[model samples]
Each structure stands twice: as structure tokens, then as C-alpha cells.
Target: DPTAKLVRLNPRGGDGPGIVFAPPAGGTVLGYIELARHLKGFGEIHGVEAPGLGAGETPVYPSFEEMVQFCSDSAAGVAGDGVYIGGHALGGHIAFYLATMLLDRGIRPKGLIILDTPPRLTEEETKVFILAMKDLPYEEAKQLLLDRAKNDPRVSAFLSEDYLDRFLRLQMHQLMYSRDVVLPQRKLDIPIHVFRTKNHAPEVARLFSAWENYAAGEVTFVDIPGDHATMLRAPHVSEVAQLLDRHCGLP
Candidate 1:
């Protein structure tokens, strides 16, 4: 049951409030299990699995807006006031919009957590991502993925064939859906937290900095120990969770 433990989060942190999490573009909640397990005592950790990524279900989402709404509604169901919301890759992107929607609904969480994902992808970068995802050798593939997944851990779940196909599908959609977004120059009075690695893309700064225009409250950045790809796993995830605990309030 430990493997399935993090599926639907409950309030174990009690007075410490809760955190709602989403998965990467691959759409599997298991990818975040280690990370959530590490954050065990800090607060309640609610994980939102992708609509159809689990075993025996084919992905059915055909639109990005529906994906966002589905993820947000799931996260919001358990997120009381003062709760925290965030996700790994695409999840973080959706979480950003979810935060805004929550604000408009007059239910503001304590803050938003963004793990290594940039909601803004320039047209050029989009081209690079969507142009081709062939049977790239290790080094070539690394270069392609390193832009966002730099300093990633040595072992990766994304290294397999299933993950490879999923990666391609995810990349294509991530790029295409990125084109679907239009971040307005609007600022909300809510704090933003960014967790990234040392090798996080330089291009990423412009995206995060743009948050300055969007964040009326503090915008804090903390460097994680691992790369964007591997930080949510194993030993690296422990440190990431510890850091999150320190920042997410309560002792």
C-alpha cells in the first residue's frame, strides 16, 4: 500500500495545513511519490494524478483548458484557505493558472509552488522542442532535454522506452500547449515560490523575472540540489522536501 499511499492526500499535518501537488507531463502520479513521501510530516500532501495516465486507461484529454480545469478542481477540492499548491513540470504550469483562478474566486492560497516549469516558452524554444524527437543517442538526447532538465540525477525513470514515448508525447503537447497560453501583465497580491536547480536554464530567468510583473507579493527563489529531471526522485527529493517543509510554514 505504500506505493499507493500518496494517491489521495488527507490532512495528517493537522494544524500545518496542506499542499496540493500535480504530476509532470508524463501524467503519472507515481513520479512524485518519493518527493511526497519525503515531505511526510510537514503537512498534508494531496497529489493530483493525470486524468488517464494510470494503468489501463488511455489518455483522453484533447484540450489543454480542460486539463487545467480538471487539475485545478481536484487540487482545490482539498485545498482549504492557507493551503499551498504546486507541481513538478506541466503541473506547475497548470497550478499557476489555478492560483489565478482561485484568486478570482476570492479563495487565495497562502502561496503557489512552481517546480522548475516555465509557463512561458518563446516561439524559438517551442520550435526546438517540437521540431523533432527522434531516436536520439544518450548525449544528443541529453542536450535536447537538458535545457529544462539540467543537473538531473544519474538514474532516471524517463530513460526507458515507455518513458521515451511518453516524453515525446509530453514534449509535443508541452510545446503546443505552451503556445496556448498568454500570460497577461497582471499582478496578483500573492507570494510565489520557485524551486529550481543550479543548472536551471538561463532563459528561465526571464520567465521567472517576468513573475515580478505578475507578483504583487514576494517572489522567492531557492536552488534545489538536483536537476529538473531527477530532483523529485530518491535522495534529491529528500532535500527538496526538507526545504519545502522549512518554507511551507509550521514547525
Candidate 2:
């Protein structure tokens, strides 16, 4: 069995449907705390941290399939019946993989949410993103991200000198993983919500198209006003929360 760590929020209090929040690449379950907090008001929230990214003891899985199986099995352990699975960025990609696996097993989620991730990247774009990361010094790369999201609230949370080094290392792991794994299909029979960043409008549009093509159910796309990294906080988070409340049929 895969030894991935599973963290549950609002475990004892909610009678509503269960929702699982999976963070993007390089992110801990804590990174998606905002989303969990929002969902907790209406339902149970399970935040899963990928092996290498959070409190999990194991190293990252060797391929996307292993990661997918790990997440599905972990979800089954806690979820008695209805479950809504969602993730942001790399987490979104993993969600897609898990969705497909569940479908193959004759299991279907109540809903699926993909946050700011594309189904695939062109060879050229992938190469450029990887080469750029590989060439930059860790500090320089972190600074570039800091500069990009200078106005984001999460910047302060991550900018401490102590955390900066570990952040860069996690980022490197994300980059390496992306280069190694091709995304899996999204073949599930459930409603899917695709949340995109308005600041990256073109890419968001592309991602929506991809999600529509892959999903086997109704797909809804919402554009939130922020870049990819900063969308977890502020106006974007509130906007997404409102959208999710409606999507999940929260009163």
C-alpha cells in the first residue's frame, strides 16, 4: 500500500458531502488550507499532501500512475461513499489521473475540480520551462517568483529566509516531476469545475478546452482575477469559494 499522508478537516462536525482538497506541485496540505477552510463550513474536507511535499514519509512516486493509485486508495480509506475530489495545478493533474482510475473501477465522484492546470504542454513550452529552471540558481529562481507575485499575500508567508531554501528545493522537485510524467486522462462520470487564473487568460482558456475534452461529465469554467500562484488568497479565493459553494450545492 502507498504510504501517503492524509489530513482531515472538520472530521466530526459535518453532515454535508465530503470534499478532498489536493494541492499543486511542491505544495503541502497547509498550502490549500484556505480552500479547506471555505469548504469546511458546508462539508468535510480532506487535504492530501503528495508524498514528497508534506508530512508524508515516502519519497515522491516514480510516475503519475503510482501517484494516482496512491491518492485513490487513500481517499477510499476515509470516504464511505460520496466524495468530491479536487486539486490545484499539479494537484489538478493528479486529480484527473485519479478520476480516471476511479471510473475504471466503477467508482464515480460527486464532483471533480481542476484548479489552474493544463492537461498537457507543448514540447517547446515544456522544454523552455524546464531549461529556465535548470539554468537558474535557486535563489534567483525564487526571487523571480517573488517578483512575479510581489503583491500577493502568500508572499509574506513564504518569504522568510528559513523557508526560502526549502521552497526552492520543493520547486525543483516539481519541475523534475513535470518533465518525467505525462498527464493521464480524465474519464469520470461526474460534474467538473475548472478554475482558471484571469491574469493568465490565454493559458486559462487553453486549459478549459482541454478539461472539456477530457472530462466525461458537465464542465464549468470560472476565471478568477489573479495569477496562478496568488489565486489561493484574497479576492481570488473568495471568488472561488463563492463559485464552489454554488457548484457543490451549499446553502
List TM-score per model, in order.
Answer: 0.74, 0.76
Question: Top lDDT: which candidate number?
Answer: 1
Expressed as tens digits, the lDDT of each residue in 151-213 for candidate 1 is 345325444444444544554555556666665555666788888777756776556656566
Model 1: how large is the Cα RMSD against the reference?
6.3
Across 193-246, the per-residue lDDT of candidate 2 in tens digits comes to 887776665644655677677767688887766777777787677777767666
RMSD of each: 6.3, 4.8
Task: Identify the runs in model 2 with alpha carbons over 4 angstroms from their true place.
Answer: 1-4, 10-15, 52-61, 121-167, 201-204
- Taking all chains together, the TM-score of candidate 1 against the true structure is 0.74
lDDT of 2 at 47: 71
Error of 1 at 124 (Å): 18
Least well predicted 10-residue stretch by lDDT in candidate 2: 53-62
